[PDB]
Design a protein around this ligand. Structure first.
Ligand SMILES: COC1=C2C[C@H](C)C[C@H](OC)[C@H](O)[C@@H](C)/C=C(\C)[C@H](OC(N)=O)[C@@H](OC)/C=C\C=C(/C)C(=O)NC(=CC1=O)C2=O
Ligand SMILES: COC1=C2C[C@H](C)C[C@H](OC)[C@H](O)[C@@H](C)/C=C(\C)[C@H](OC(N)=O)[C@@H](OC)/C=C\C=C(/C)C(=O)NC(=CC1=O)C2=O
Lengths: 214, 214
């Protein structure tokens, strides 16, 4: 109970401003980046489990799952990857300077394509193209479940999780989509962009659709 | 944190034994009863909201939703009805003698059909036909979210909810299905039985299916 606030490294809060206020037209690349991160966290736990099998027991199923929640205008990208501890959330998701942050921005300025973001190692923030608020719910075998939240301001909060479903292991990227990005709540659109830029994913990508029984 | 244990009224733990160990063949009637209860809790909040509109604000959408969770061999029936407080869970779901409990059993003995259960006012326990463990996660506007759990023994537990997703208002019936009742995790089967016995439900019945993107 009760959150802790942290300030974002100055260049990182710069990137977010840049991304959130970026009339860019190829916004669909955010799914590519998030699915890509999901697959990377699944690789880690798998590789890591090569000499530590028990690590898998917390969730034997390796997968990636997208769940749109229309009523809340939310879209969630989930994975049963290695997950992150509270330290790593605070550490890697905000307070510590990141290698490619400044470079990408300059590249972006020189006319670079926003889809290069992933090549600069800061693709997670691409999510701010379609969303104006996000929660990173994560659970690592080495710690408890926590919620990392941000609205692209200058500070972010980390809270012990007591309000969300329990994920065996992994992360959930809960994106509160912009009022004009609701198209990513639609099954067709989602399926469309997953096929366009995510053909070589090694884990099953599951889409959760809700339908009224006729 | 930390659960409280309660004993079941003696006749009620009798009914459960009777139901769980009942070779009956028309087990699909459990969905009828649970959907029926869902629709009843939705009626209450609606009616009740006739003179207390704000009561709806906690969850403006009236609906019923079934979500099978294969990996956990779980099936959930959810509704955004009036929900129940901790008192009512302890009170109405176990400790207080119920009017039709003894009568149904006798009727069942005289050769009655198990699907009459709902007519005796004890249809909730029909769920024990396909499941051997259940959790009633509920949240009423008049209280906090709690988890009521049972395995058909002689006692049940009520715990303040800190491990499940937050439901605006309503109840979730999390049924841990029997090893031979997994057929209710299948979309076809589910859709089949909903159409068979639940044609006159006034609220949208939503089915949540998970599928791998081709
Ligand atoms: C090759 O490694 C990658 C890294 C290094 C990273 C910090 C190491 C990290 O340690 C804490 C874990 O190894 C790893 C399991 C987790 C993630 C990918 C997360 O994905 C999920 N589902 O867990 C993502 O979660 C919202 C979090 C931060 C990502 C940043 C700032 C980014 O923008 N780009 C990157 C993409 C990568 O794949 C990146 O920097
Ligand atoms: C006409 O009223 C009904 C009652 C009276 C009942 C105790 C009053 C109750 O007060 C606490 C609320 O008014 C009501 C909102 C909630 C429910 C139906 C629940 O459904 C959900 N989704 O909330 C069900 O939840 C697992 C709980 C207990 C049910 C029992 C023991 C039963 O087996 N049969 C009955 C079916 C009914 O519809 C029944 O007895």
């Amino acid at each position: 109970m009760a959150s802790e606030t942290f300030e974002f490294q100055a260049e990182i809060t710069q990137l977010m401003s840049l991304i959130i206020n970026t009339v860019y037209s190829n916004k669909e690349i955010f799914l590519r980046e998030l699915i890509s991160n999901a697959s990377d966290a699944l690789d880690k736990i798998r590789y890591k489990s090569l000499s530590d099998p028990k690590q898998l027991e917390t969730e034997p199923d390796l997968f990636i799952r997208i769940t749109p929640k229309p009523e809340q205008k939310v879209l969630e990208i989930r994975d049963s990857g290695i997950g992150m501890t509270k330290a790593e959330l605070i550490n890697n998701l905000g307070t510590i300077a990141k290698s490619g942050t400044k470079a990408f921005m300059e590249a972006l300025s020189a006319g670079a394509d926003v889809s290069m973001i992933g090549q600069f190692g800061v693709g997670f923030y691409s999510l701010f193209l379609v969303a104006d608020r996000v929660q990173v719910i994560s659970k690592s075998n080495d710690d408890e479940q926590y919620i990392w939240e941000s609205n692209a301001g200058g500070s972010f909060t980390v809270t012990l999780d007591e309000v969300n479903e329990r994920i065996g292991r992994g992360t959930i990227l809960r994106l509160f989509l912009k009022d004009d990005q609701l198209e990513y709540l639609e099954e067709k659109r989602i399926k469309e962009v997953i096929k366009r830029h995510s053909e070589f994913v090694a884990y099953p990508i599951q889409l959760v659709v809700t339908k009224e029984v006729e």
